[PDB]
Amino acid sequence: MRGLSRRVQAMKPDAVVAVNAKALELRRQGVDLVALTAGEPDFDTPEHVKEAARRALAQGKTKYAPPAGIPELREALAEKFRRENGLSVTPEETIVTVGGSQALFNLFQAILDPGDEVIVLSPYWVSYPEMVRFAGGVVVEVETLPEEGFVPDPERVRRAITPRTKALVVNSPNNPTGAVYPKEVLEALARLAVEHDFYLVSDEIYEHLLYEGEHFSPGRVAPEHTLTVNGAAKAFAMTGWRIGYACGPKEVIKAMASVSRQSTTSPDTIAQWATLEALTNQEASRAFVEMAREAYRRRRDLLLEGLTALGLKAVRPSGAFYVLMDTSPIAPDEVRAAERLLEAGVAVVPGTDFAAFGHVRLSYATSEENLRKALERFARVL
Template identity: 75%
Template structure:
């Protein structure tokens, strides 16, 4: 019988992608719009990374790569894990994917059976529960709120563990909240995974964008149960290069590789060589990351102070480049509030509905200070 599959018909499109596409279309139509929707650095990819891609092209490195990624990049990822995260993950326990999103998608395809439960900490990135459902799993939410800085209580997590719990997703620093989980919280989560025998899926894509405190990888506590996911997009402004990676237990990584081999085969070979340079040229990489982090730190101060001054409660979180703002003063319905911001203030934001953040919208401050100040002025005008 003709028609789409049930799994596709029940799959929600990415809200962030959809809203950003709408903002880009309005801009193409000539609308004077400030887009604060996408989680995309406004910096250009560093020159030393682009030059590595040019060298790869000149050397004819344009053929298929192995499904797990080129050996040189897997070695660089292994070295990065040890150097920056204190993790002993050999190259053969790593995999390169088409962005961090594919690493997560293939991971859930590899580990979930129908009915398996995956704990997700809300507010969460919109794709986590949809990926779980697509793999026929069941997302189980543990909510958090601004009063705790969006930091989960491990006791609340433990209460959601059942015999069907297969994994928990941890995203620190987090999207959409910007929350950075303390070491003791991450340690407690890893210990729960050991106690109840489930996986920790640690999405660390924003690890270099921390303004107070330090990053901690739960794989340091439970290496045999943790899959660490990362990528090039946020740290190196390489969103369009589509390079992600993961490291963890070899049997899980093999499962991810097997899924890749029957879908994308491998990421772009030239982009992989560029990523080798991004990870191995530590001095240049650190220079770029420091520059970007300090710029985001300044922008965070402007937007948090500005939104709070306008009567839109906004926690001063410690990482990533997002804030969740309570927009009840504009409209108790976050979707209507986002629509009013778009139609009247010409400021595009993402409503918190699909993040499990009612009454809130997400502002991305991966844009210039000038744009942030202009957006605040426009919001003040409609208030």
């Protein structure tokens, strides 16, 4: 008989997708509300990358591509993870997916049998649990503390390991805290995976938005259990392009390529060519990477000051582009504080779903003129 399934019936809505829609419509019915919501640059994808997407169209590069992605993008990927991430993978252990989202979604479906446990460390990015659950798994969450700077303590984690525990999700830089996990913690979590036999998913998609610290890929350590998950969506202002990449054990890679086929067949072919240009033309991308990074650092400092100038508490991020801001003042909860703040003319994402209660998540990847126009409304409301 008819009716929706119960796995798509049990999923919780995106807090981000929900807040955006809202913001938008008001921008439509009069309303000019500065929106510090979504995690996407304001910068437009570099010209050297665009030129190549035109060059792709021009050469009629519009046919189907392997479910695992074109052999070229695939090869440059084996040098990115290599040259940059220090990892040592051959192209067969590489895979192009439809965003960072696909590489995780395919990843969880290929290693999660119903009832398997996956340890997420809170606060976490809104999706991880929903993906881990849509696959049949169960969310075992380890807390990470503001007093500890949100960097995880491998003992609270080791403690969480059951015989069901199949995977552990680490994210450095971190959404929504901005925390950059230091080599040793990362190297520690890796050995837990090796010691208790489980996969370590490592979502290093903000590896480049690293203001202070060094970026360590845990995969260098546990190459047989680690599953690195990157993406060309943050580093190159390519959020609308929907290109992601990942790597790890050959074994689990082809399995992700299988789910890749039944679902999307393979990602855009024009977009894979453009992405290749971002990975191979170094001189031009490095120039852009650095350029963007500084505008982000500047915005961070500008925000973090003004926040502190109103006495609004928030932890200092060393990566990505989010600042978790305690709303204790504006209102009791994260919810109402957001409804208060939206009136003031500022769209923020409540940290209820990130397991960041009390706080609200704001993004400084937007204009400078805007962090300011927002910072002024906070004043009144404050």
